[PDB]
Design a protein around this motif. Sequence first.
Motif, PDB file in Angstrom:
ATOM      1  N   UNK B   1      36.918  29.711  34.249  1.00 39.51           N
ATOM      2  CA  UNK B   1      37.154  29.547  32.785  1.00 39.51           C
ATOM      3  C   UNK B   1      36.899  30.858  32.051  1.00 39.51           C
ATOM      4  N   UNK B   2      37.161  30.859  30.744  1.00 36.00           N
ATOM      5  CA  UNK B   2      36.895  32.031  29.912  1.00 36.00           C
ATOM      6  C   UNK B   2      35.403  32.121  29.564  1.00 36.00           C
ATOM      7  N   UNK B   3      34.648  31.048  29.824  1.00 35.11           N
ATOM      8  CA  UNK B   3      33.188  31.100  29.759  1.00 35.11           C
ATOM      9  C   UNK B   3      32.604  31.956  30.886  1.00 35.11           C
ATOM     10  N   UNK B   4      33.227  31.904  32.064  1.00 35.18           N
ATOM     11  CA  UNK B   4      32.779  32.686  33.224  1.00 35.18           C
ATOM     12  C   UNK B   4      33.463  34.053  33.358  1.00 35.18           C
ATOM     13  N   UNK B   5      34.361  34.385  32.434  1.00 32.19           N
ATOM     14  CA  UNK B   5      35.013  35.694  32.437  1.00 32.19           C
ATOM     15  C   UNK B   5      33.973  36.790  32.192  1.00 32.19           C
ATOM     16  N   UNK B   6      34.127  37.922  32.878  1.00 31.71           N
ATOM     17  CA  UNK B   6      33.224  39.056  32.705  1.00 31.71           C
ATOM     18  C   UNK B   6      33.720  39.945  31.561  1.00 31.71           C
ATOM     19  N   UNK B   7      33.101  39.790  30.395  1.00 32.67           N
ATOM     20  CA  UNK B   7      33.466  40.565  29.211  1.00 32.67           C
ATOM     21  C   UNK B   7      32.811  41.947  29.206  1.00 32.67           C
ATOM     22  N   UNK B   8      31.837  42.151  30.090  1.00 29.05           N
ATOM     23  CA  UNK B   8      31.091  43.405  30.154  1.00 29.05           C
ATOM     24  C   UNK B   8      31.638  44.401  31.184  1.00 29.05           C
ATOM     25  N   UNK B   9      32.895  44.243  31.584  1.00 25.69           N
ATOM     26  CA  UNK B   9      33.531  45.188  32.498  1.00 25.69           C
ATOM     27  C   UNK B   9      34.985  45.428  32.095  1.00 25.69           C
ATOM     28  N   UNK B  10      35.532  46.572  32.502  1.00 18.72           N
ATOM     29  CA  UNK B  10      36.943  46.885  32.284  1.00 18.72           C
ATOM     30  C   UNK B  10      37.835  46.170  33.304  1.00 18.72           C
ATOM     31  N   UNK B  11      39.002  45.715  32.841  1.00 12.01           N
ATOM     32  CA  UNK B  11      39.920  44.895  33.634  1.00 12.01           C
ATOM     33  C   UNK B  11      41.303  45.516  33.716  1.00 12.01           C
ATOM     34  N   UNK B  12      42.105  44.971  34.625  1.00  5.29           N
ATOM     35  CA  UNK B  12      43.483  45.392  34.806  1.00  5.29           C
ATOM     36  C   UNK B  12      44.369  44.633  33.841  1.00  5.29           C
ATOM     37  N   UNK B  13      45.587  45.129  33.677  1.00  2.27           N
ATOM     38  CA  UNK B  13      46.614  44.444  32.910  1.00  2.27           C
ATOM     39  C   UNK B  13      46.753  42.991  33.354  1.00  2.27           C
ATOM     40  N   UNK B  14      46.930  42.787  34.655  1.00  4.30           N
ATOM     41  CA  UNK B  14      47.163  41.447  35.194  1.00  4.30           C
ATOM     42  C   UNK B  14      45.999  40.505  34.911  1.00  4.30           C
ATOM     43  N   UNK B  15      44.777  41.012  35.015  1.00  8.24           N
ATOM     44  CA  UNK B  15      43.589  40.210  34.713  1.00  8.24           C
ATOM     45  C   UNK B  15      43.533  39.800  33.246  1.00  8.24           C
ATOM     46  N   UNK B  16      43.922  40.709  32.356  1.00 11.98           N
ATOM     47  CA  UNK B  16      43.986  40.405  30.929  1.00 11.98           C
ATOM     48  C   UNK B  16      45.076  39.366  30.643  1.00 11.98           C
TER      49      UNK B  16
END
Lengths: 74, 301
Positions: B1-16
């Motif tokens: 879920x978006x509750x378990x998404x890691x907001x404290x790291x940089x992500x790829x296009x696909x992950x976003x």
Amino acid sequence: NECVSKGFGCLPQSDCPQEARLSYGGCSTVCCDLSKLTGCKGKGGECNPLDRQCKELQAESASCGKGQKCCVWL
Amino acid sequence: STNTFNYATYHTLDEIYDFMDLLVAEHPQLVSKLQIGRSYEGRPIYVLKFSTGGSNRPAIWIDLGIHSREWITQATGVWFAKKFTEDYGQDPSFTAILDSMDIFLEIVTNPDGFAFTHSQNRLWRKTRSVTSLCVGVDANRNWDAGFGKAGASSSPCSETYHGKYANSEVEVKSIVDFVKDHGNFKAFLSIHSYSQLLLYPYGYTTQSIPDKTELNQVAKSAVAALKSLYGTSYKYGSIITTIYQASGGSIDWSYNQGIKYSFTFELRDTGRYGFLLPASQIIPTAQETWLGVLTIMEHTV
Ligand SMILES: [Zn+2]
Ligand SMILES: [Zn+2]
Ligand SMILES: [Zn+2]
Ligand SMILES: [Zn+2]
Ligand SMILES: [Zn+2]
């Protein structure tokens, strides 16, 4: 990729001196330790003529040579 | 879920992009995913619409990541998206904003550049359009507001290259088409880094905007709110007087379309890390920036 996940970044070979290169994977250029870079391009700047209005990175302007200064575009 | 998404790291296009789908699936009454166009390299360009319904509600535009290397912006965009779904129904001020207004959020305005910063060139700024053996256009020099005039470069190899013609870049034309066809945007916020600044128009001319007194006061208040969280100090003013003359820029164009509350943020830091801001500063940056953005939205409403 491994490069980025370890805290670094991909750069063209021509923008990453040998001493700053890393073995980490995922780049179709090379993984670079960007903390070890010096000069204008290495600090996110671009060499421009002196008459261009810009935010100068004065510490890196000498690397741009005669008639040029280091500008960072935001 | 978006509750378990890691907001404290940089992500790829696909992950976003996967994050967008997850957020929409979880909050289908509040958020929807729009494709506003397709990038030069064939990638979908996505905007999230946050709305509680209504008809022709006054709208707030927020674009992030127009300049691909400014990774703090895309990261802040992801955090904003979640924050909107978290605080709607809780924070009375924000609830009131979304009950009267729609928000359109573009987390990755330059997706081709973003991918490229991850796999080849971390410091890439421009789009990836080709013709030349040099690549890309400065998408924040491509807008139809002083296009091709002083404040951009005519050299294709330049980092501030304006492109062949105004809106030549599909990444810009897509926003222009969307905003003009919508017809009721009241705010337009372009999110960049770095320098810790809040800017209003113009970049392309020294002429002061008609609304200078009001936007300057709004900027002052937003900057004070931002500072309250962690003490982060922002300066503010017109683009041309604060950083440099810049032509073909996003908020110059939006303001000229009649979108009054047009501002450009420059996020953390002031040069220590520059574009290479450590991931540990993502959350604190996004939090404080949200206080600034909310202040602008409150004045709009
Ligand atoms: Zn990767
Ligand atoms: Zn920028
Ligand atoms: Zn992809
Ligand atoms: Zn939720
Ligand atoms: Zn106000």
